[PDB]
Design a protein around this ligand. Structure first.
Ligand SMILES: OC[C@H]1O[C@H](OC[C@H]2O[C@@H](O)[C@@H](O)[C@@H](O[C@H]3O[C@H](CO)[C@@H](O)[C@H](O)[C@@H]3O)[C@@H]2O)[C@@H](O)[C@@H](O)[C@@H]1O
Length: 137
């Protein structure tokens, strides 16, 4: 019915439906700042001062094979998701965020089952970074 909750889920839960375009959008820097399914509906911290990260090229969810999610104690505070490595069905991968600015890290690896379309992304944020996310089928 879905993936595990990657990262942490203590903060507020938002739900972002995947459109027919099958896209996942992220803002990231040294951590994961926000996640959405359109350029307009990202869930996470605002672009405020020097915070908020950079909007990255979207992930084609219909092309996604697996994720490797690194979470930990971010050096500027709190437990959040700091990096996501997306491996695609063509064999390529992209790493957003960073593993180098957090302690007490964990890595969670998950493969999207063949024939399962990701229909929704649940995202947990307290208003600064992304603490967790989950795929729903
Ligand atoms: O993706 C997370 C973050 O990554 C990049 O900023 C990294 C950190 O850089 C530090 O120099 C500092 O600016 C951090 O921001 C926190 O700490 C400062 C200093 O106390 C504070 O003013 C801020 O409000 C934050 O609490 C950064 O996290 C950038 O890509 C950034 O845009 C992105 O959010």
């Amino acid at each position: 019915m879905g993936s595990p909750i990657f990262g942490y889920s203590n903060t507020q839960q938002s739900q972002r439906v995947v459109t027919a375009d099958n896209l996942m959008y992220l803002r990231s820097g040294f951590a994961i700042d926000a996640i959405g399914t359109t350029v307009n509906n990202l869930v996470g911290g605002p672009v405020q001062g020097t915070n908020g990260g950079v909007l990255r090229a979207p992930i084609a969810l219909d092309q996604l094979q697996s994720v490797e999610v690194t979470s930990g104690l971010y050096n500027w505070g709190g437990y959040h998701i700091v990096a996501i490595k997306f491996t695609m069905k063509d064999g390529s991968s992209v790493l957003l965020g960073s593993t180098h600015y957090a302690s007490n890290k964990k890595v969670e690896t998950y493969t999207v089952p063949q024939g399962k379309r990701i229909k929704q992304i649940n995202v947990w944020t307290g208003g600064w970074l992304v603490e967790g996310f989950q795929f729903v089928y």
